[PDB]
Design a protein around this ligand. Sequence first.
Ligand code: HEM
Ligand SMILES: *[C@@H]1O[C@H](CO)[C@@H](O[C@@H]2O[C@H](CO)[C@@H](O[C@@H]3O[C@H](CO)[C@@H](O)[C@H](O)[C@@H]3O)[C@H](O)[C@H]2NC(C)=O)[C@H](O)[C@H]1NC(C)=O
Ligand SMILES: *[C@@H]1O[C@H](CO)[C@@H](O[C@@H]2O[C@H](CO)[C@@H](O)[C@H](O)[C@H]2NC(C)=O)[C@H](O)[C@H]1NC(C)=O
Ligand SMILES: *[C@H]1O[C@H](CO)[C@@H](O)[C@H](O)[C@@H]1O[C@H]1O[C@H](CO)[C@@H](O)[C@H](O)[C@@H]1O
Ligand SMILES: *[C@@H]1O[C@H](CO)[C@@H](O)[C@H](O)[C@H]1NC(C)=O
Ligand SMILES: *[C@H]1O[C@H](CO)[C@@H](O)[C@H](O)[C@@H]1O
Ligand SMILES: *[C@H]1O[C@H](CO)[C@@H](O)[C@H](O)[C@@H]1O
Ligand SMILES: *[C@H]1O[C@H](CO)[C@@H](O)[C@H](O)[C@@H]1O
Ligand SMILES: *[C@H]1O[C@H](CO)[C@@H](O)[C@H](O)[C@@H]1O
Ligand SMILES: *[C@H]1O[C@H](CO)[C@@H](O)[C@H](O)[C@@H]1O
Ligand SMILES: *[C@H]1O[C@H](CO)[C@@H](O)[C@H](O)[C@@H]1O
Ligand SMILES: *[C@H]1O[C@H](CO)[C@@H](O)[C@H](O)[C@@H]1O
Ligand SMILES: *[C@H]1O[C@H](CO)[C@@H](O)[C@H](O)[C@@H]1O
Ligand SMILES: *[C@H]1O[C@H](CO)[C@@H](O)[C@H](O)[C@@H]1O
Ligand SMILES: *[C@H]1O[C@H](CO)[C@@H](O)[C@H](O)[C@@H]1O
Ligand SMILES: [Mn+2]
Length: 299
Amino acid sequence: QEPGSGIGYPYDNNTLPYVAPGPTDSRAPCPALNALANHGYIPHDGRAISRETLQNAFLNHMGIANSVIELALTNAFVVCEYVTGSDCGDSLVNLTLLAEPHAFEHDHSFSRKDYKQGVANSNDFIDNRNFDAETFQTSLDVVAGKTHFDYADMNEIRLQRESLSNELDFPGWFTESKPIQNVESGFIFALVSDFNLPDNDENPLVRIDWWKYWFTNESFPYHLGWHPPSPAREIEFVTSASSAVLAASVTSTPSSLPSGAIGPGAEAVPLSFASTMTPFLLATNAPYYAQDPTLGPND
Ligand code: HEM
Ligand SMILES: *[C@@H]1O[C@H](CO)[C@@H](O[C@@H]2O[C@H](CO)[C@@H](O[C@@H]3O[C@H](CO)[C@@H](O)[C@H](O)[C@@H]3O)[C@H](O)[C@H]2NC(C)=O)[C@H](O)[C@H]1NC(C)=O
Ligand SMILES: *[C@@H]1O[C@H](CO)[C@@H](O[C@@H]2O[C@H](CO)[C@@H](O)[C@H](O)[C@H]2NC(C)=O)[C@H](O)[C@H]1NC(C)=O
Ligand SMILES: *[C@H]1O[C@H](CO)[C@@H](O)[C@H](O)[C@@H]1O[C@H]1O[C@H](CO)[C@@H](O)[C@H](O)[C@@H]1O
Ligand SMILES: *[C@@H]1O[C@H](CO)[C@@H](O)[C@H](O)[C@H]1NC(C)=O
Ligand SMILES: *[C@H]1O[C@H](CO)[C@@H](O)[C@H](O)[C@@H]1O
Ligand SMILES: *[C@H]1O[C@H](CO)[C@@H](O)[C@H](O)[C@@H]1O
Ligand SMILES: *[C@H]1O[C@H](CO)[C@@H](O)[C@H](O)[C@@H]1O
Ligand SMILES: *[C@H]1O[C@H](CO)[C@@H](O)[C@H](O)[C@@H]1O
Ligand SMILES: *[C@H]1O[C@H](CO)[C@@H](O)[C@H](O)[C@@H]1O
Ligand SMILES: *[C@H]1O[C@H](CO)[C@@H](O)[C@H](O)[C@@H]1O
Ligand SMILES: *[C@H]1O[C@H](CO)[C@@H](O)[C@H](O)[C@@H]1O
Ligand SMILES: *[C@H]1O[C@H](CO)[C@@H](O)[C@H](O)[C@@H]1O
Ligand SMILES: *[C@H]1O[C@H](CO)[C@@H](O)[C@H](O)[C@@H]1O
Ligand SMILES: *[C@H]1O[C@H](CO)[C@@H](O)[C@H](O)[C@@H]1O
Ligand SMILES: [Mn+2]
């Protein structure tokens, strides 16, 4: 928000306004990075981003401690080297390259289509990067009529998304990514679980309106009473939440789940790519921004 607005106070004492991305700006397949870039906490153009810039942006403006993004930074730069063909040092070339498929970006996302989702031909690919309202609605509908959801509900959401993706993706494309997705499940609990409930740290419940605002608008749900978690969330909270989602009892089993969908997941680890492997082409679509309504500087 505008720095004088005081909207972030006393949690964020140095806010910057929302500015929609323009057609030449680089955006990510990540709703967090996109929100940060829309506020200029990382470059508004989404280019040439250092680790420290990301660390400070997350810590000071989202209540996410450095520990939470350690592996994410490692993988961002692994993917940068893979996509660009050379070491990216400590300047991430852009956000868009993070949508390189079957890498850090993965199938069965909560709010993005898959790279080969619903394509008639094997060489076809689509926008697996920008927010997709229809896709996100398939996640939201699992918790329809609710204001909050818990670990078991999140497990049901990711199963629905796995089922849909496995059915809709071009044959042979779908690849399960439980470890990375469920770190992201933990990220959702970390950012938009309801800290106004007495047992939030032990038993976090996601506020659906907060989640929907963050994902749809790629800005922060301050108007809904959200604020950055304080103290900043740490990695322990995230991986615990991740394990709790995958441990939760499934009471509704979708059909067409991949092998081993139900049950614990492997620890997320550093990515690696063969030098022989050429990257998949990146979707080239202009960056998504909310248009129904468009957002003001304080939104
Ligand atoms: C340097 C830090 C980060 C990097 C490089 C990064 C990168 C990514 C990438 C590549 C994806 C796409 C995966 C996919 O859904 O196919 C993604 C998704 C996601 N990210 Fe980030 N991320 C970072 C930090 C965070 C943080 C701190 C949060 C929240 C606290 C966050 C929230 C999410 C969520 C919820 C998704 C899933 C979106 C969906 O499934 O529709 N990210 N991120
Ligand atoms: C974010 O950065 C990535 C990585 O640099 C950009 O993707 C790459 O964009 C270049 C064009 O600047 C593409 O190069 C072109 O490739 C074709 C086919 O190989 C070739 O015939 C052309 O002469 C040219 O070299 C490159 O393919 C592409 N990389 C991938 C894997 O898709 C991306 O455009 C950047 N996005 C933004 C919004 O800044
Ligand atoms: C995206 O952001 C807009 C702007 O903040 C949301 O629309 C507003 O919602 C706030 C409460 O968060 C209300 O005070 C305003 O009356 C609304 N204004 C307008 C112009 O509609 C919108 O709800 C957000 N989208 C989602 C899905 O959360
Ligand atoms: C991205 O741009 C490429 C050319 O630069 C196209 O070949 C791709 O199909 C893809 O096009 C999509 O996004 C662009 C924005 O660059 C739109 O102009 C197209 O209409 C399309 O949606
Ligand atoms: C914001 O400023 C107030 C008043 O000076 C202060 O009490 C608070 O600690 C500040 N918040 C942060 C996160 O620095
Ligand atoms: C989440 O899981 C990690 C291991 O992946 C632990 O280090 C952390 O304490 C939490 O249980
Ligand atoms: C790890 O931490 C999470 C979040 O604090 C808990 O919900 C979980 O039960 C475990 O203690
Ligand atoms: C990972 O951690 C979660 C949260 O404590 C457990 O519920 C799960 O069984 C696994 O050990
Ligand atoms: C069985 O119960 C779980 C508990 O959350 C739900 O997520 C599911 O929809 C089904 O009703
Ligand atoms: C749906 O079915 C699966 C496998 O049959 C169970 O693991 C799940 O608990 C739910 O009943
Ligand atoms: C229980 O929930 C799962 C996941 O949302 C569905 O696949 C199933 O149809 C039932 O409603
Ligand atoms: C979230 O984190 C837990 C604990 O490391 C994993 O088991 C899960 O697969 C996801 O990566
Ligand atoms: C990480 O691992 C891959 C193999 O999966 C190697 O090709 C790469 O060079 C790095 O060691
Ligand atoms: C990268 O590009 C090579 C050819 O240069 C392909 O063979 C490969 O499948 C990938 O698309
Ligand atoms: C979002 O932006 C548009 C202009 O692009 C306005 O018409 C709207 O009222 C809101 O400010
Ligand atoms: Mn994805």
